[PDB]
């Protein structure tokens, strides 16, 4: 579970070192994001020869959260660092194509099916 | 349809083989014996009065024991009410057990919650909470304004001030009945059921299909 203003990191290699969450999609006053949620971000730190820079309003999808995903049996999956992966503003189908760090199984639906192609694990 | 009564004996988990962990609830359904059947010609409406459990000798009184005496049934611990659904028929003394609920899929469980006590408005009605260190003084948790200025000149009836939270009677709905076990007399129904580990419950079939 991650809500606004959070200095999240980014798991693929687009340019994004540390991004920040500002407007959590999908809900009319939804405060909370997670296991497959779509949040809206911008980059605060890039590499020099990245696709992106600091200062571009972008749309992402969470995978890691430091609170963890609830499995249907009662297993919890805690990481030690949040991550979301950058996409297009509207043609989502992500920018970056090599991801560091694993993911969890709860995306798995027809839109993010690249992420099991770029999964390193799970 | 008629409902039935027994205690509530805690919570556990029931594990399906695929890996779902249903957080389950146990309800111990005794013999539920019918004590008096009421009817339209003598009461204007028809229902039944049920009686359950075992109670000692030297506690039930002769105004109580007399209405037990007319059936030939034993000293139960209380007298509840269940309305007949105008089809099903019963007799005085007849026990009706947990295998009644064999073909139900959902039940409406109702009972008395815990007594949370004389609880604050932050706790009771979920008023949102103000500041606590900005220079604020002596209004850290209390509700605030309770009404408009001069022209109402009173308070409306029912404006959500603190009350002794809990212990009324709280009805939960659409509870998936999980398992109907007849031998150990234990009834298993999905979810979170009001009551303590031992209180009184009323479980009845769902009107909301």
């Amino acid at each position: 579970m991650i809500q606004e203003q959070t200095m999240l990191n980014v798991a693929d290699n687009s340019g994004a070192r540390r991004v920040m969450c500002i407007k959590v999609l999908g809900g009319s006053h939804r405060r909370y994001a997670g296991v497959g949620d779509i949040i809206k971000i911008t980059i605060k730190e890039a590499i020099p020869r990245g696709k992106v820079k600091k200062g571009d309003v972008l749309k992402a999808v969470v995978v890691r959260t430091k609170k963890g995903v609830r499995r249907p049996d009662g297993s919890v999956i805690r990481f030690d660092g949040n991550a979301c992966v950058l996409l297009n503003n509207n043609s989502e189908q992500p920018i970056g194509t090599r991801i560091f760090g694993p993911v969890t199984r709860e995306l798995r639906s027809e839109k993010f099916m690249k992420i099991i192609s770029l999964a390193p694990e799970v | 349809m008629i409902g039935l009564v027994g205690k509530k004996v805690g919570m556990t988990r029931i594990f399906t083989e695929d890996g779902v962990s249903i957080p389950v609830t146990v309800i111990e359904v005794e013999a539920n014996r019918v004590t008096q059947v009421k009817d339209l010609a003598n009461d204007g409406y028809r229902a039944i009065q049920v009686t359950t459990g075992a109670k000692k000798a030297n506690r039930v009184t002769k105004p109580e024991a007399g209405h037990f005496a007319k059936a030939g049934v034993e000293a139960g611990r209380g007298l509840w009410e269940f309305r007949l659904a105008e089809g099903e028929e019963f007799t005085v003394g007849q026990s009706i057990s947990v295998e009644l609920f064999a073909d139900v899929k959902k039940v409406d469980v109702t009972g008395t919650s815990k007594g949370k006590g004389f609880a604050g408005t932050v706790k009771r009605w979920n008023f949102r909470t103000q500041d606590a260190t900005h220079g604020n003084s002596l209004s850290h948790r209390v509700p605030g304004s309770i009404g408009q200025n001069q022209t109402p000149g009173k308070v409306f009836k029912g404006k959500k001030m603190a009350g002794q939270m809990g212990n009324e009677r709280v009805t939960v709905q659409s509870l998936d009945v999980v398992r109907v076990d007849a031998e150990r007399n234990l009834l298993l129904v999905k979810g979170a059921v009001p009551g303590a580990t031992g209180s009184d419950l009323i479980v009845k079939p769902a009107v909301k299909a």
Partner: protein, 114 residues
Amino acid sequence: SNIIKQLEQEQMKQDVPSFRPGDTVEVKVWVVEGSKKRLQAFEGVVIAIRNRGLHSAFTVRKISNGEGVERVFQTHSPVVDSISVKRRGAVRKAKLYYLRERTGKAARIKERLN
């Protein structure tokens, strides 16, 4: 109780191994992708075990590809296929929650070798 406990022992599986905290177990979990009913495993460090019989579970921390996922498993559930210790560690604390705060060399334990 005795009433509800009698329900608890008729799905509780019979022989699990003993792990302490500080061991390096392998816990292979069941997982379903579409039609296939397959096996996936975990190679980490057990750092806490909470005993309540049917309600027991344990926290096994592996350092995966850049970060240390910390995953739990409810011990009597049908999701867990197998339990096998790789190496045993001589810890003193019973629920090591401070091994999220060490990485690399300091997060090694020892061997028990009792």
